[model samples]
Target: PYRAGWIHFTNVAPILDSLELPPGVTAITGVPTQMNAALLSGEVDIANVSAVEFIRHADTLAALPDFSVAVLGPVYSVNLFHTCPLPELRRVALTSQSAMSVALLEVLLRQKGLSPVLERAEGTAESLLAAGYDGVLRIGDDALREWYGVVGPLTPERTMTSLPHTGRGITVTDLAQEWFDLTGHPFTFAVWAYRKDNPPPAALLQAMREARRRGIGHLAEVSQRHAEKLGLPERVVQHYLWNFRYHLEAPDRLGLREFADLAVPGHAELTF
Candidate 1:
């Protein structure tokens, strides 16, 4: 294992903080969207970014071929949740931070001949619960168990309805797997992308890689520690750990291409 700096959801703050690092170690926190900006601005040496961000701005960052933030398989098994016991319901309000989730939801809905309102829920349980929407699709490490349980996890037949040709979660079920099958290229889920103009030295890169290795190996312990700090049960932390996938591959290059292919030129954008 080598040294690497790991960053993730707020639930992992305590576990990451209590981690023992070498003398040259440091940790910082901020929105995931800002990770790339920070690295580009030279505010941080290395930062993690989603697969979509890396694809959109690959030229601005140098990605390691051997590294990935998420494993190539099922990063996280997504679910479609409905408030009431309405299997006939189609429209679903999605509470997500990334455009990928929204696009995926829309594509799936259209395929099934169902039209969802695609309402944005401000990514909070309170906001979503107050809205009283039919259903919501979520994908992330940090989520509310209460709402998730309320919304039953739909099966492929219930949600997928039909399969699309180009979009993911269609023919390929898992998000990560579909990305790999579609694009020969792959990357970590939360990657340590650095600026192309001034990349970090190999030693630093090694350290960061090692840090990630440790995180993966000790996920159970980290989950428990962070869960305790959050006053949440270990089951909650375990859910996220088992659901959220991390690795350091090249990235899903084709996923972005497919999105841009379908998006309405200037209208469609990647916010976070």
Candidate 2:
């Protein structure tokens, strides 16, 4: 019954901050995909989601495509970080619910000249230590936190190879970039979507734009706020924001079309 909606953005901090939101707007934040579903189910009016998921589920939900935030380069990456006794321990496990992560993990492993043995297990630092797997691909805020003692710098393969100077781990590569190159679209990690019929009003839409504009107006503050929220160092938060570029561009659209090909499976239709 509300006249407006709250859109979520995971990596597009600049865009999210810069969004021009109207008055009387409420900002509700949550996981992108979950929020997207909530919006489709009529639980919320607007939310952020993955273009991949949108194209993937267009028919299933009859969802409507909206404006894009921005494309940041391989903004987020999930890789297997491990401190095992031996490097030969190639097998690993992902959480039961992380299908996309698993898929992306598979792509990453393949890129790294390794094969994965997928299993359902709790994906956590403790769980990772307990299982003694080679490494577990961590994502989101969890991934950032691990950067200190868990994740290390990128290697020649540009992956989480060895901990090196750091005892924790190292970053290998951002599979999202590979996703963008392979598919053309930026493998939209989190996108904004709404119901096909009822979307946020024009004023509210403009307001969301204002919100992004305003949010970006204070990058240091935004980073500081996130650092406090996550209990992370401001530098780490700044690094995360730096690593991710938050603008959707031409290649992103092309990537969406290719992903759409996969989404269609056999039959395909118009591109709007």
Candidate 3:
């Protein structure tokens, strides 16, 4: 039997909605952190999780080919919200829900010759901000909801001060966009990877590829399905899904390679 840990995020809805686990392929749902724990502890054989996790445990994991959750530019989700200028940023609180985003933020800051302290805020964005952090990292639907001014459990402490407050004093930097600016390559947030020892059967791999194909083909429908939940316009949701790359190619590999250079220590090359 194959156990799979699927990431439960709005951006990944297309794949999840279209996915159908084959017989003997079972799956569970959770945030990226949960999925990461499952994948690392061998609770699940395969998972869509933080790309850093794959590199951190590259000795055991191999990425699945032709699959990733990446963005060419500006991901509405996965942003850093700050009340002050970035140059003046002393510290930032990060969500505990992601590994890649935390590392990406650190890597990008290092590239800019900045070294602000990063701490995990085990609460919502507003809660962290309220506690006086210069900036806060929010990922997945929580960040997306903040970008759209849609109040949710992630920001339970307060409603957004303004509709799309990105332009209103708060400098909202999309981490993926920062990557694209620096390297002119897509930024991969997560990938479907599995343990190398217990490789997935060919049929299971084929099923995933087919599911991704179907999902990408029907992104508009998928966006419509998720728009209401995110409190975003249908077109915006469709556009968000459209910009996110679900299929990895040569360019994506190069992009991932560029990231590994900065983030993954000692891992010289890709493993897929």
Instruction: Give the number of the best model, judged by TM-score.
Output: 3
Candidate 1 lDDT over 1-272, as tens digits, reads: 22233456633332343455546646565766555566656567566565455555666766554444453444433444454433355455666556545555554455456765666665443345346666656655434343323333333353321223122111112445444554443423444566576555665556545765666667677778776765555655565555433432224333444544443334333222
RMSD of each: 8.4, 5.4, 4.9
Which stretches of candidate 1 lie above 4 Å from their native place?
Answer: 1-7, 10-27, 71-80, 84-96, 110-115, 123-132, 139-141, 144-188, 230-232, 239-245, 249-272
Cα lDDT of model 3 by residue, 149-177, tens digit: 63222233432232243554556778888
Please write out the lDDT profile of model 2 over residues 216-270, one tens digit for every residue: 5666777787778777666556656655433444555565555456544553342
TM-scores of the candidates are 0.60, 0.71, 0.89
Tell how far residue 239 is off in model 2, in angstroms. 3.8
Task: Report, for every candidate in turn, its global Cα lDDT versus the true structure.
Answer: 0.49, 0.53, 0.78
Q: Clashes in each model (backbone N, CA, C under 3 Å)?
A: 25, 42, 0
Name the lDDT value of residue 93 in candidate 3.
93
In model 2, the number of clashes is: 42
A best-first ranking of the candidates according to their TM-score comes to 3, 2, 1
Q: Candidate 2 — worst ten consecutive residues by lDDT sum? A: 1-10
TM-score of 1: 0.60
Return the top candidate by lDDT.
Answer: 3
Any idea what lDDT model 3 has?
Answer: 0.78
